[PDB]
Amino acid sequence: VRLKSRYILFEIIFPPTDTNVEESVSKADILLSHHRASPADVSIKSILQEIRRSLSLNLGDYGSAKCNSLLQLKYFSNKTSTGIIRCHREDCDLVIMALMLMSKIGDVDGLIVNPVKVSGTIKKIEQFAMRRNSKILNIIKCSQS
Amino acid sequence: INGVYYNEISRDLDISSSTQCLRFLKETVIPSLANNGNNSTSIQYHGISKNDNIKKSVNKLDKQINMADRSLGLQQVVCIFSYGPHIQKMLSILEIFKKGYIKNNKKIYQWNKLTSFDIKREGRNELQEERLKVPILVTLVSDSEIIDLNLHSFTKQ
């Protein structure tokens, strides 16, 4: 038999909330201003605890009990703000709605969570991440001109 | 066609009319890739359309290669250019000239360059716009091997 897994790829995007400063309107400029960096106070257990709190706060008791059976963060590094969340094929919608309803980190505010790719294996997730990273470099090279 | 774009700059051109685009290519894209001031080259411009006679074009080309005087030391380069579907006839005329010239135990040295015009059309729906690319092939043929022109972006052939 096989345990049906479904990994979730999410991105942490920081909107440049600053109305006093004028900004450049282009593709790579806003891509760089949205993918600047993640703060130092960012780890796996700090994001897992936050998502576990938000799950109980939005869904409830049974909604967190059914979802927290196989809720783990397999791969995440704070340099690129890319994480892979493992869950069931039944509770994928719950985890996606919780990642959408993520308000803020307990000490860091002003950020959004974007679910990009959902798949049932890590190899296709890695391939899609490599493809996205390769696509990102194109607009950068084009705008550096 | 809603508009014509070259070098991320909008221009006032028309794809169906060959005269305006050929004059624009002769006046703008060639000076942006080769400079005739800092050297001693005699550049002969020639654009090819699909309605031109191949034999008359070759009879013009074999004369355009020996127009300048040879005593003072002028290197004579002829630059042929076209765009769109006329590039096929351009290549045909270039190959026929090569075949008719190389027979006399001589050699023609060639440099190639390929760029693109960016045109915009209205898509199937009203909320979609398609972006088409028109190729531009510019070739420089000369009897001498070394040319002081800025030919680093070309292709030696």
């Binding site: - | 199937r124 729906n125 909320l127 979609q128």
Partner: protein
Amino acid sequence: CTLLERGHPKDNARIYQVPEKDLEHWLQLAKGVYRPNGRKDHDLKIPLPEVHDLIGFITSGTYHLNCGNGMGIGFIDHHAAIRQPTRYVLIRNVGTNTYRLGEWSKISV
């Protein structure tokens, strides 16, 4: 007969001729009918034809891998071939109740 639109043929398939009243609908479907989203649109009501329009049977129905579509090898009547002013022909399966559109080309074998 080759399929120009969504559809998969099979062996022992029925070949019908396009009628005269709904002749512009199939032409517009073969030209193009898209959605406001942008993609194609074939989720519409099909003009089911009559019964006395069967002019052939497909003997070799298999998905053509050399062109990317459904190739149908059938045998149509010459009188019905001269009857129509167009090369458009409908294809149907033996269990399926859908009619696909295509165009046929002569084979000299």
